């Protein structure tokens with residue numbers, strides 16, 4: 001199929017692009033590289049075993065999107081592009097609503113112009129809000145996210161649902177990610193955050209690689225087995241695979257298909273630390289710090305729907321997630337080249 005992968009050079013989009021190419025689809029990446037580098041493209045190429053087309057641009061550019069879609073005879077669009085730093089979203093709301101909400105709206109607006117009607121959105125588990133019912137199920141109503149980032153995602157899910165209804169031939173999937181970690185098994189691709197990592201794993205990897213002193217565990221007084229926060233960690237390769245199936249199965253299937261993407265199991269901070277310590281052959285240094293604003297104690301997915309309906313499920317373990325992350329980090333300590 002002809003797919004447009006926005007944010008395609010980004011972290012999750014780069015691995016999805018490799019897997020799309022392995023399944024022989026025609027890929028066209030669209031990225032403004034505000035959080036990624038060209039240096040990945042070649043890697044995507046190699047690992048993908050085929051050449052994806054890249055266009056540097058912005059999702060907010062209605063006319064460009066509309067051109068790209070027409071020009072490349074796009075069949076479906078995978079939209080990973082946007083801003084996702086929770087914390088900064090609290091300092092700079094405006095920029096989050098503009099790139100996520102408005103960026104999305106520009107993109108879909110163009111889709112509408114080019115007669116494009118198959119779509120896959122990068123959603124979150126945060127949409128569930130502060131839901132005491134765990135694990136989370138798609139049939140639960142949505143709550144009120146603590147952050148502007150959380151909010152932009154949800155708002156986009158509403159806009160997309162409202163569009164789908166007015167234009168019922170559309171095929172829209174709302175892929176709610178949980179906690180994506182890990183890297184390409186080759187160790188040649190991986191998450192490459194610039195500056196201080198806001199996420200557990202990268203942070204961990206950074207301490208491990210020796211760039212950081214200690215991992216700060218935000219809280220130890222939670223209502224969990226070990227007192228640390230619990231999340232459903234999902235290998236990025238699993239994620240990718242899923243995106244490939246969603247796209248292949250959902251195309252031209254009218255409706256709003258909501259699916260949770262996770263391992264459907266919970267792991268605590270210490271758990272992750274332990275997996276990582278084991279993978280890197282040494283004790284990961286950490287200490288306990290206070291609770292992180294906004295943080296929820298524990299949650300994980302109920303990913304039965306994806307299983308039944310798409311026949312999709314996670315095949316990688318927590319161990320590999322740590323191993324592959326260590327491999328990457330250790331093989332490319334400076335990340336992707338300038």
Ligand SMILES: NC(=O)c1ccc[n+]([C@@H]2O[C@H](COP(=O)([O-])OP(=O)(O)OC[C@H]3O[C@@H](n4cnc5c(N)ncnc54)[C@H](O)[C@@H]3O)[C@@H](O)[C@H]2O)c1
Pocket residue numbers: 006007008009010011012013030031032033034035036057058059060079080081082083084099103122123124125177178179180
């Ligand atoms: N990684 C996570 O922890 C998390 C959890 C759930 C949701 N997601 C979502 O999935 C998507 C991908 O996340 P990720 O980890 O790969 O993020 P990422 O930063 O690695 O991917 C974003 C990419 O999009 C590009 N970009 C940003 N805004 C742009 C714009 N307006 N126009 C064009 N390109 C733009 C960035 O350069 C980057 O390549 C995002 O929407 C994110 O909200 C990921």
Ligand SMILES: O=c1ccn([C@@H]2O[C@H](COP(=O)(O)OP(=O)(O)O[C@H]3O[C@H](CO)[C@@H](O)[C@H](O)[C@H]3O)[C@@H](O)[C@H]2O)c(=O)[nH]1
Pocket residue numbers: 084124125126177178179180198199200201203215216217218219229230231269292295296
């Ligand atoms: O240095 C750190 C970082 C994280 N944590 C804890 O680790 C868990 C994971 O936190 P983190 O990796 O930052 O993930 P999230 O808070 O779980 O949010 C990520 O995943 C969310 C969906 O679950 C999305 O809303 C966001 O896009 C995404 O960045 C949490 O309980 C944190 O308190 C620490 O103790 N120390």
Ligand code: NA
Pocket residue numbers: 090091
């Ligand atoms: Na502020």
Ligand code: NA
Pocket residue numbers: 193194195196197198
């Ligand atoms: Na960062």
